[PDB]
Amino acid sequence: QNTAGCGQNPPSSGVKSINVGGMNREYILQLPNNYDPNKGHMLIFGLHWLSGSMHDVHPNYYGLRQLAGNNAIFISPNGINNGWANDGGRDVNFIDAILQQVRSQLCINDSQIFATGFSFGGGMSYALGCARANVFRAIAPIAGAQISGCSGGTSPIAFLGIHGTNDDVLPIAMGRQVRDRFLQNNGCQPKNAPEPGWGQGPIKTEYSCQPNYPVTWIAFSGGHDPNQSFVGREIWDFFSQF
Ligand SMILES: *[C@@H]1O[C@H](CO)[C@@H](O[C@@H]2O[C@H](CO)[C@@H](O)[C@H](O)[C@H]2NC(C)=O)[C@H](O)[C@H]1NC(C)=O
Ligand SMILES: COc1cc(/C=C/C(=O)O)ccc1O
Ligand SMILES: [Mg+2]
């Protein structure tokens, strides 16, 4: 179902500021090349990593921008202290405030709201899946871990996890913990997920879960690096199935 912003004159793309409980915070809004204000769009949050900023995720959005056509609106929010510590839920509240604002300004399909990010931004995507499973259709942490909290975390939500076997910063076992939570929440049948050897190609494992709540795990043989050529393709294909 489409939001109240449908049919309204659109704002401009660029850096926006927003008051969150007295705290001034900032995000980048990127409209598609051809924005039809009468068509419901996907909404994709891309979340930066530690010591990064919103300006590192924009303009490429982990490879999604080049694949998305006119179907998606992109948002790159800025973390406090170049991170997503999410103290007391303040970063979940930030996302709540962005959503309230953009849904009233833009034509968004409420069943196509997504979040993805790398490392600390993958932790933050996980926190949104824990606390806002009613809002987000799917999350895709890249080298994620439980480092931004997880309040709630019992509801199902479609999940794609990507992680490198030789990641020395957030070891892959931390990403498997995130995955295993949604294998339980989504009612997935137990299944072995093989992971590649050194110098071997990525291995994607698709689980059998409740119909609306798929779980996919992709392990690649590299390290702490989101710039693999399959990343944008796999995330887009996962998001566009809904
Ligand atoms: C908003 O998004 C939903 C889900 O993507 C759309 O519902 C889909 O409609 C297409 C039409 O063939 C089919 O793939 C399915 O029937 C629906 N997919 C689901 C429910 O996952 C919906 O049409 C979009 N637009 C509006 C106005 O709701
Ligand atoms: C190991 O624990 C942590 C790791 C990170 C790394 C974030 C990043 O690389 O983006 C952040 C916070 C942590 O508590
Ligand atoms: Mg298109």
Please state the domain extents for the chain. Answer: 14-239
By the 8 A CB rule, do 224 and 166 touch?
no
Q: Report the distance separating Cα 183 and Cα 172, nearest Å.
A: 16
Tokens 């590299």 sit on residue: 222
Ion ligand 3 — residues with CB < 5 Å = 69-71
Instruction: Give dist(CA 136, CA 150) in Å, integer.
Output: 15
Residue 41 Cα to ligand 3 midpoint, Å, equals: 10
Q: How far apart are CA 49 and CA 117, in angstroms?
A: 7
Burial track 180-211 (b if 16+ CB lie within 10 A, e otherwise): ebbbebbebeeeebebbeeeeebbebebebee
Query: Out of 3.40.630.10, 2.102.10.10, 3.40.50.1820, 3.40.50.720, which CATH number does the structure's domain 14-239 have?
Result: 3.40.50.1820
Q: Is the CB of 6 under 6 A from ligand 1?
A: no
Instruction: State whether residue 67 is helix, strand or coil.
Output: coil
Q: Determination technique for this PDB entry?
A: X-ray
Distance CA 31, CA 129 (A): 24
SS3 sequence of 205-237: EECCCCCCCCEEEEEECCCCCCCCHHHHHHHHH
DSSP letter, residue 9: P
Q: How many helical (H) and strand (E) elements, i.e. helices and strands, does the chain have?
A: 5, 9
User: Are the C-beta atoms of 215 and 185 separated by less than 8 Å?
Assistant: no
Within 8 A by CB and 6+ apart from 127, the residues are: 84, 86, 91, 92, 148, 149, 150, 151
Give the separation between CA 203 and CA 218, rounded to whole angstroms.
6
In the Cβ-directed half-sphere of 62, how many Cα atoms lie within 13 Å?
Answer: 31
Resolution of the solved structure (Å) = 2.0
